[PDB]
Design a protein around this ligand. Structure first.
Ligand code: MG
Lengths: 414, 409
RNA sequence: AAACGGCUCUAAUCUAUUAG
DNA sequence: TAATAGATTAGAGCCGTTTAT
């Protein structure tokens, strides 16, 4: 009648069959193909080939040369060809150069090639269709697009699925109530490194900015005693984070910057007591667990250290405190490599190449689980990490990262 | 729990007025938006390079598949896609045998300059060769594609192990797709455009390139290069910003016969108040001028809790009315895979200056991620504004440039 | 330099403070 | 001038080629 039938090797010849079928439908041809239907079928096939088909096409590839469905469709199409007495009812479509001469099906061989080019093959098929009286409609690529969207992208859309996401950001549960600027005029040596103090401390002006109480640095700074705490400037941390406190002594943005520096220094100092190893990144310190420091190199069923060929990978983390959306700790994930699990590889090129090799097969689930397992490994209590900013002051980092949810998602590939 | 918003995936128009979301799929189905009828290739290189390019041309005439043909659409063949012939029989070859090598290739090109695009085949046997070659070809307006010999014949170049140095076995079809799209775009044919382009919105990519002291470069996207070296700050002087915005507005007025109703300036740097007042003092009153700063690798990583696949592309975290995170990368449902490896980095988009709806800004940026004509990919990590601005800026800093992007990409 | 990402590394600048 | 931060920024390499079949 008017239909155009294409028979093909369904599992492997889908690319050419899809291209040809949608191209022909874009040209106005009434194409019938097994790939143009959803939730399909041999009675319908045989019926379309027997009565509806005007021209019957077969992708003559090596894989499709001897296939049960292809051969069955070829047989019924040969029956219809004998019934209609059309010399060119069945048109082989030679697309595979691997299919050698005298190796194609006996019926096919004595009967257009796409091996050299698909455009040349499509043009030959088109001119054959014009030489015979193959019915066609005016070129309507709109319906080709519609069929492509309706069938080939039917299971490949964004659906109305409620999806939940874990983030890089672990909320800061609480801060010490007061940020204190201690006026260690001479008791703090001018050349003393405040980074070497027991608790995070920033020299700010004529003061030491810290969450620590004024006599917390007694051991490191013996002269800290006999210092009056009245001259210390005490600022509510909530005032700093809410932007309420703006004073000539220290700008609000500078106060938040000092708070973030204290957070970063407190995290750095806490990793010292967290039985974890450190690795100097370009701009920060990543923190990784040695081999043998975890039971079977696992924490709560998540492998944080493993083997890469003759090397050992360790899931490391680096944390930067931030306060803009909410007080959080952004934890970047890294893979840090060691020769035997304890001894770092000195060369950064080998470290980077190994990081790429290990992150090859690391995906959303792996990165998420490793980040969460490492953060829970640094947990002090059930749901928080303690950063000792002072003897009686702590910064609490949430064990659980910030949670997100969207009303759109996808069906996961299987 | 923060609510995520989803930006609907933009469609891109192709031939016969057909819109889809994948440049590869749309090109294979409907054909290129602009139909050129042939690509005459000019080859500059050695005899080995000419043979490599000819072999790759014969190969790309035939269909080429990827390892994953569902995740990465395979290449049907150049003529089967673009409806025109790009063959090795239509090749004019200039036989060969950093500044002197650039001069060699440049002279071999301009002496002959009727080709559509000149293909510079680079022998493997110079970190500024491409940019300089591209820059001194600007005044003679040659569309050029530089192809390393280890790209067209990536198998033939191996390490001491014997494995290929550049492993393109899994992305051979994607490599053919990208090379075909680059050659077609440089030959004068736009393969797609935005399916929906808001009328009267002008898109500007404003980047700064460190000349080896920083050169500001603006590229206007028509759905337009600008350059000026200056001191070591990523900001524009009053007169410099005024000249930039005036040139962009006049280019838009020439193209569309009217001034834009909105102008969006995309940058990787925040705008200071001085340069923004300079921008505002030259824009028309009815034109809304918005300064959008897009930063990459800001340490946020949304991990899909349930599955092994990442956050879907198009999800956006609206931090503020002016600040947000946009996942221009991530899982693509149509591709059934991710545009990125491991977990995607969202781009942080801030409305630093001006007033605009943040959702509309992220929609525009997601749309502009589709116009990367330098690559035949589903979508880009960053909008074509910033990407093409960076390309033409690094190209210009190598030392009036042409306004067509095919002379830079 | 087909290209895009993920990473790593190196710098520069602006702030705020301090030592000159 | 130098140092300590936090923030922004850019530039160079380098590796993999996006979990299925
Ligand atoms: Mg290019």
């Amino acid at each position: 009648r008017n239909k155009i039938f294409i028979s093909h090797a369904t599992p492997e010849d889908d690319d050419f069959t899809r291209w040809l079928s949608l191209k022909l439908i874009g040209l106005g041809y009434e194409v019938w193909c097994d790939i143009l239907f959803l939730d399909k079928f041999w009675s319908t096939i045989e019926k379309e080939i027997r009565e509806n088909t005007c021209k019957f096409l077969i992708v003559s590839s090596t894989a499709g040369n001897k296939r049960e469905g292809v051969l069955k469709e070829l047989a019924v199409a040969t029956k219809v060809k004998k019934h209609l007495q059309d010399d060119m009812f069945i048109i082989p479509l030679a697309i595979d150069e691997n299919l050698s001469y005298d190796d194609i099906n006996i019926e096919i061989v004595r009967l257009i090639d796409f091996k050299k080019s698909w455009a040349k093959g499509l043009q030959d098929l088109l001119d054959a269709f014009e030489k015979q009286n193959v019915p066609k409609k005016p070129p309507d690529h709109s319906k080709s697009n519609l069929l492509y969207q309706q069938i080939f992208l039917h299971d490949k859309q964004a659906i109305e699925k409620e999806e939940t996401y874990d983030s890089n950001w672990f909320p800061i549960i609480s801060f010490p109530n007061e940020l204190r600027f201690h006026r260690y005029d001479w008791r703090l040596p001018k050349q003393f490194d405040v980074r070497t103090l027991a608790f995070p401390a920033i020299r700010y002006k004529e003061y030491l900015c810290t969450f620590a109480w004024e006599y917390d640095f007694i051991h490191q700074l013996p002269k800290t005693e006999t210092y009056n705490g009245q001259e210390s400037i005490r600022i509510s941390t909530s005032d700093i984070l809410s932007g309420r406190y703006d004073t000539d002594f220290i700008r609000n943005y500078e106060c938040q910057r000092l708070i973030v520096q204290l957070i970063n220094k407190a995290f750095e100092l806490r990793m010292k007591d967290k039985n974890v190893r450190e690795y100097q990144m370009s701009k920060t310190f990543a923190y990784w667990i040695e081999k043998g420091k975890l039971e079977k190199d696992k924490f709560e069923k998540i492998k944080l250290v493993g083997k890469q060929k003759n090397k050992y990978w360790h899931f490391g983390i680096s944390a930067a405190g931030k306060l803009y959306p909410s007080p959080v700790l952004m934890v970047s994930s890294h893979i840090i490599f060691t020769m035997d699990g304890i001894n770092l590889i000195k060369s950064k090129s080998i470290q980077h190449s190994s990081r790429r090799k290990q992150g090859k097969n690391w995906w959303n689930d792996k990165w998420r689980e490793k980040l969460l397992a490492f953060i829970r490994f640094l947990s002090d209590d059930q749901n928080a990490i303690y950063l000792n900013v002072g003897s009686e002051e702590k910064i609490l980092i949430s064990n659980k990262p910030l949670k997100f949810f969207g009303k759109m998602s996808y069906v996961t590939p299987s | 729990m923060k609510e995520l918003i989803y930006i609907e995936e933009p469609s891109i128009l192709f031939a016969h007025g057909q819109k889809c979301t994948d440049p590869r799929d749309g090109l294979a189905l409907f054909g290129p938006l602009n139909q050129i009828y042939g690509i005459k290739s000019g080859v500059v290189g050695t005899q080995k390079g000419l043979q490599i390019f000819k072999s790759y041309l014969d190969k790309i005439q035939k269909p080429i598949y990827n390892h994953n043909n569902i995740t990465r659409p395979m290449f049907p063949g150049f003529e089967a896609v673009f409806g025109c012939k790009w063959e090795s029989q239509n090749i004019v070859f200039k036989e060969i045998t950093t500044y002197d090598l650039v001069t060699l290739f440049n002279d071999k090109i301009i002496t002959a300059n009727r080709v559509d695009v000149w293909f510079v085949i680079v022998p493997e046997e110079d970190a500024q060769f491409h940019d300089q070659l591209k820059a001194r070809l600007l005044e003679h307006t040659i569309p050029t594609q530089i192809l390393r010999e280890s790209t067209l014949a990536w198998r033939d170049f191996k390490n001491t192990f014997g494995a290929p140095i550049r492993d393109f076995s899994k992305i051979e079809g994607h490599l053919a797709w990208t090379i075909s799209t680059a050659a077609y775009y440089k030959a004068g044919g736009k393969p797609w455009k935005l399916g929906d382009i808001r009328p009267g919105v002008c898109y500007l990519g404003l980047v700064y390139k460190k000349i080896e002291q920083n050169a500001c470069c603006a590229a206007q996207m028509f759905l337009g290069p600008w350059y000026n070296p200056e001191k070591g700050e990523y900001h524009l002087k009053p007169k410099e910003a005024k000249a930039l915005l005036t040139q962009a507005l006049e280019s838009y007025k020439e193209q569309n016969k009217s001034y834009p109703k909105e102008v969006f300036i995309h940058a990787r740097t925040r705008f200071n108040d001085e340069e923004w007042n300079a921008f505002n003092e030259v824009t028309p009153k009815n034109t809304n001028l918005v300064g959008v700063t897009i930063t990459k690798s800001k340490p946020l990583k949304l991990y899909k809790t349930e599955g092994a696949f990442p956050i879907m592309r198009g999800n956006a975290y609206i931090v503020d009315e002016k600040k947000a995170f946009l996942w221009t990368l991530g899982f693509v449902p149509k591709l059934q895979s991710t545009l990125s490896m491991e977990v995607p980095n969202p781009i942080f988009i801030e409305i630093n200056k001006g007033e605009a709806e943040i959702q509309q800004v992220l929609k525009d940026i997601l749309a502009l991620t589709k116009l990367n004509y330098n690559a035949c990919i589903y979508a880009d990590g960053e909008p074509v504004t910033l990407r093409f601005a960076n390309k033409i800026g690094e190209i210009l800093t190598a030392s009036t440039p042409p306004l067509a992007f095919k002379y830079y990409i």
